[PDB]
Ligand SMILES: CN1N=C(N)c2cn([C@@H]3O[C@H](COP(=O)(O)O)[C@@H](O)[C@H]3O)c3ncnc1c23
Protein backbone atom coordinates (compact mmCIF):
# COMPACT_ATOMS: atom_id res chain seq x y z
CA UNK A 263 0.00 0.00 0.00
CA UNK A 264 1.16 3.56 -0.85
CA UNK A 265 0.46 6.87 0.97
CA UNK A 266 -1.93 7.82 -1.86
CA UNK A 267 -4.05 4.81 -0.82
CA UNK A 268 -5.20 7.04 2.05
CA UNK A 269 -8.11 8.77 0.34
CA UNK A 270 -9.07 11.10 3.19
CA UNK A 271 -8.02 11.92 6.77
CA UNK A 272 -9.12 14.32 9.53
CA UNK A 273 -8.93 14.57 13.32
CA UNK A 274 -11.53 11.83 13.68
CA UNK A 275 -10.99 9.24 10.95
CA UNK A 276 -9.07 7.74 8.01
CA UNK A 277 -10.25 6.34 4.67
CA UNK A 278 -8.09 3.84 2.77
CA UNK A 279 -8.23 1.34 -0.09
CA UNK A 280 -8.82 -2.30 0.71
CA UNK A 281 -5.85 -4.28 -0.65
CA UNK A 282 -8.10 -7.33 -0.92
CA UNK A 283 -10.97 -5.68 -2.86
CA UNK A 284 -14.31 -7.47 -3.37
CA UNK A 285 -15.49 -4.96 -5.99
CA UNK A 286 -13.87 -2.62 -8.56
CA UNK A 287 -14.15 0.12 -5.93
CA UNK A 288 -13.59 -1.01 -2.32
CA UNK A 289 -12.41 1.15 0.51
CA UNK A 290 -12.45 1.35 4.32
CA UNK A 291 -13.46 4.06 6.77
CA UNK A 292 -12.03 3.77 10.29
CA UNK A 293 -12.11 5.95 13.43
CA UNK A 294 -8.79 7.02 14.90
CA UNK A 295 -10.31 6.09 18.27
CA UNK A 296 -9.80 2.32 18.61
CA UNK A 297 -13.37 1.12 19.00
CA UNK A 298 -12.73 -2.64 18.56
CA UNK A 299 -16.30 -3.60 17.42
CA UNK A 300 -19.53 -1.76 16.66
CA UNK A 301 -21.13 -3.82 19.47
CA UNK A 302 -18.76 -2.04 21.85
CA UNK A 303 -19.43 1.53 20.73
CA UNK A 304 -21.12 3.61 23.43
CA UNK A 305 -23.42 6.65 23.58
CA UNK A 306 -20.48 9.07 23.66
CA UNK A 307 -19.51 7.80 20.20
CA UNK A 308 -22.73 9.08 18.61
CA UNK A 309 -21.32 12.11 16.73
CA UNK A 310 -18.23 10.12 15.66
CA UNK A 311 -20.36 7.29 14.30
CA UNK A 312 -22.49 9.79 12.37
CA UNK A 313 -19.30 11.41 11.07
CA UNK A 314 -18.00 8.05 9.76
CA UNK A 315 -21.16 7.48 7.69
CA UNK A 316 -21.07 10.97 6.17
CA UNK A 317 -17.42 10.49 5.25
CA UNK A 318 -18.25 7.12 3.72
CA UNK A 319 -20.99 8.80 1.66
CA UNK A 320 -18.76 11.70 0.56
CA UNK A 321 -15.88 9.40 -0.39
CA UNK A 322 -18.29 7.22 -2.38
CA UNK A 323 -19.31 10.30 -4.36
CA UNK A 324 -15.70 11.36 -4.86
CA UNK A 325 -14.87 7.85 -6.10
CA UNK A 326 -17.54 7.82 -8.81
CA UNK A 327 -20.10 5.58 -7.12
CA UNK A 328 -23.04 7.60 -8.41
CA UNK A 329 -24.90 4.56 -9.78
CA UNK A 330 -24.90 2.89 -6.36
CA UNK A 331 -22.90 1.20 -3.63
CA UNK A 332 -23.05 -0.79 -0.39
CA UNK A 333 -21.82 0.02 3.13
CA UNK A 334 -20.99 -2.90 5.40
CA UNK A 335 -20.03 -3.23 9.05
CA UNK A 336 -19.02 -6.65 10.40
CA UNK A 337 -19.21 -7.64 14.06
CA UNK A 338 -17.56 -10.70 15.61
CA UNK A 339 -17.08 -14.19 14.15
CA UNK A 340 -20.55 -14.54 12.64
CA UNK A 341 -20.15 -11.12 10.99
CA UNK A 342 -16.82 -12.33 9.58
CA UNK A 343 -15.06 -9.34 11.20
CA UNK A 344 -11.40 -9.63 10.13
CA UNK A 345 -9.73 -6.99 12.32
CA UNK A 346 -10.88 -5.91 15.77
CA UNK A 347 -11.06 -2.22 14.98
CA UNK A 348 -14.27 -0.65 13.62
CA UNK A 349 -14.35 -0.60 9.77
CA UNK A 350 -16.97 0.67 7.40
CA UNK A 351 -16.59 -1.12 4.04
CA UNK A 352 -17.67 0.81 0.95
CA UNK A 353 -18.11 -1.35 -2.17
CA UNK A 354 -19.18 -0.16 -5.63
CA UNK A 355 -18.48 -0.30 -9.35
CA UNK A 356 -20.39 -3.55 -9.89
CA UNK A 357 -23.85 -4.95 -9.19
CA UNK A 358 -24.01 -5.93 -5.52
CA UNK A 359 -25.97 -9.14 -4.92
CA UNK A 360 -28.60 -10.18 -2.38
CA UNK A 361 -28.38 -11.61 0.32
CA UNK A 362 -25.29 -9.65 1.47
CA UNK A 363 -23.35 -12.76 2.52
CA UNK B 364 -45.87 9.07 0.38
CA UNK B 365 -42.58 7.91 -1.12
CA UNK B 366 -42.55 4.26 0.10
CA UNK B 367 -44.31 1.44 1.92
CA UNK B 368 -42.18 2.32 4.98
CA UNK B 369 -44.40 5.43 5.36
CA UNK B 370 -47.28 3.04 6.13
CA UNK B 371 -45.23 1.20 8.76
CA UNK B 372 -44.24 4.54 10.35
CA UNK B 373 -47.83 5.88 10.45
CA UNK B 374 -48.97 2.46 11.74
CA UNK B 375 -51.55 1.84 8.98
CA UNK B 376 -49.59 -1.28 8.10
CA UNK B 377 -48.94 -3.55 11.11
CA UNK B 378 -45.28 -4.52 11.52
CA UNK B 379 -43.25 -6.50 14.08
CA UNK B 380 -41.82 -3.47 15.92
CA UNK B 381 -38.76 -4.00 18.14
CA UNK B 382 -38.02 -0.44 19.17
CA UNK B 383 -39.32 3.09 18.66
CA UNK B 384 -38.47 6.63 19.74
CA UNK B 385 -38.99 10.09 18.31
CA UNK B 386 -36.18 9.80 15.78
CA UNK B 387 -36.54 6.23 14.51
CA UNK B 388 -38.33 2.86 14.27
CA UNK B 389 -37.04 -0.73 14.26
CA UNK B 390 -38.96 -3.67 12.79
CA UNK B 391 -38.37 -7.16 11.43
CA UNK B 392 -37.82 -7.69 7.72
CA UNK B 393 -40.76 -9.57 6.12
CA UNK B 394 -38.32 -11.48 3.89
CA UNK B 395 -35.50 -12.30 6.31
CA UNK B 396 -32.13 -13.39 4.93
CA UNK B 397 -30.95 -14.66 8.32
CA UNK B 398 -32.57 -16.10 11.49
CA UNK B 399 -32.54 -12.54 12.84
CA UNK B 400 -33.03 -9.77 10.29
CA UNK B 401 -34.50 -6.39 11.23
CA UNK B 402 -34.38 -2.83 9.85
CA UNK B 403 -33.50 0.43 11.60
CA UNK B 404 -35.07 3.42 9.87
CA UNK B 405 -35.21 7.14 10.59
CA UNK B 406 -38.58 8.83 10.92
CA UNK B 407 -37.12 11.68 8.83
CA UNK B 408 -37.59 10.42 5.27
CA UNK B 409 -34.08 10.56 3.82
CA UNK B 410 -34.55 8.41 0.64
CA UNK B 411 -30.97 7.07 0.51
CA UNK B 412 -27.62 7.45 2.30
CA UNK B 413 -26.11 9.36 -0.64
CA UNK B 414 -28.72 12.06 0.06
CA UNK B 415 -27.94 12.52 3.76
CA UNK B 416 -26.43 15.88 4.72
CA UNK B 417 -24.16 17.16 7.50
CA UNK B 418 -27.23 18.18 9.52
CA UNK B 419 -28.05 14.44 9.65
CA UNK B 420 -24.84 13.56 11.50
CA UNK B 421 -26.45 13.15 14.93
CA UNK B 422 -29.37 11.10 13.50
CA UNK B 423 -27.00 8.76 11.60
CA UNK B 424 -24.96 8.03 14.72
CA UNK B 425 -28.20 7.44 16.62
CA UNK B 426 -29.38 4.92 13.99
CA UNK B 427 -26.11 2.98 14.41
CA UNK B 428 -26.31 2.98 18.22
CA UNK B 429 -29.94 1.80 18.03
CA UNK B 430 -28.85 -0.98 15.61
CA UNK B 431 -26.18 -2.16 18.07
CA UNK B 432 -28.50 -2.04 21.14
CA UNK B 433 -31.24 -3.99 19.34
CA UNK B 434 -28.68 -6.54 18.14
CA UNK B 435 -27.73 -7.07 21.79
CA UNK B 436 -31.40 -7.42 22.77
CA UNK B 437 -31.95 -9.94 19.92
CA UNK B 438 -29.11 -12.11 21.25
CA UNK B 439 -26.58 -11.49 18.46
CA UNK B 440 -23.61 -11.67 20.85
CA UNK B 441 -21.70 -14.09 18.60
CA UNK B 442 -21.80 -11.45 15.87
CA UNK B 443 -23.77 -9.85 13.06
CA UNK B 444 -23.64 -7.64 9.95
CA UNK B 445 -24.94 -4.11 9.31
CA UNK B 446 -25.79 -3.26 5.69
CA UNK B 447 -26.86 -0.09 3.91
CA UNK B 448 -27.80 -0.26 0.21
CA UNK B 449 -27.64 2.83 -2.01
CA UNK B 450 -29.08 2.96 -5.53
CA UNK B 451 -29.35 0.36 -8.27
CA UNK B 452 -25.87 -1.14 -7.99
CA UNK B 453 -26.17 -1.28 -4.20
CA UNK B 454 -29.39 -3.28 -4.83
CA UNK B 455 -31.50 -0.67 -2.97
CA UNK B 456 -35.21 -1.28 -3.58
CA UNK B 457 -37.04 0.69 -0.88
CA UNK B 458 -36.11 4.35 -1.22
CA UNK B 459 -36.24 5.26 2.45
CA UNK B 460 -32.91 5.11 4.33
CA UNK B 461 -32.49 2.00 6.51
CA UNK B 462 -29.89 -0.21 8.11
CA UNK B 463 -30.21 -3.98 7.76
CA UNK B 464 -29.11 -5.92 10.83
CA UNK B 465 -28.47 -9.61 10.10
CA UNK B 466 -27.46 -12.30 12.59
CA UNK B 467 -27.95 -15.83 13.95
CA UNK B 468 -25.95 -17.58 11.21
CA UNK B 469 -22.44 -17.30 9.78
CA UNK B 470 -22.42 -14.45 7.26
CA UNK B 471 -20.24 -15.10 4.18
CA UNK B 472 -17.63 -13.01 2.35
CA UNK B 473 -17.88 -11.10 -0.01
CA UNK B 474 -21.04 -9.36 1.28
CA UNK B 475 -22.93 -9.93 -1.99
C1 LIG C 1 -44.93 -4.59 5.28
N1 LIG C 1 -43.76 -4.68 4.40
N2 LIG C 1 -43.93 -4.61 3.00
C2 LIG C 1 -42.92 -4.67 2.12
N3 LIG C 1 -43.20 -4.59 0.66
C3 LIG C 1 -41.52 -4.85 2.62
C4 LIG C 1 -40.19 -4.97 2.08
N4 LIG C 1 -39.35 -5.10 3.16
C5 LIG C 1 -37.89 -5.27 3.14
O1 LIG C 1 -37.28 -4.03 2.91
C6 LIG C 1 -35.91 -4.29 2.50
C7 LIG C 1 -35.45 -3.26 1.51
O2 LIG C 1 -34.03 -3.28 1.43
P1 LIG C 1 -33.27 -2.71 0.16
O3 LIG C 1 -33.57 -3.77 -0.87
O4 LIG C 1 -31.85 -2.62 0.65
O5 LIG C 1 -33.96 -1.39 -0.07
C8 LIG C 1 -35.89 -5.74 1.96
O6 LIG C 1 -35.09 -6.55 2.82
C9 LIG C 1 -37.36 -6.17 2.03
O7 LIG C 1 -37.55 -7.54 2.32
C10 LIG C 1 -40.09 -5.07 4.30
N5 LIG C 1 -39.85 -5.16 5.63
C11 LIG C 1 -40.84 -5.08 6.54
N6 LIG C 1 -42.13 -4.92 6.23
C12 LIG C 1 -42.47 -4.84 4.93
C13 LIG C 1 -41.39 -4.91 3.96
Ligand SMILES: [Cl-]
Pocket residue numbers: 336342343344345349
Ligand atom coordinates in the same frame (compact mmCIF):
# COMPACT_ATOMS: atom_id res chain seq x y z
CL1 LIG D 1 -14.21 -6.46 8.81
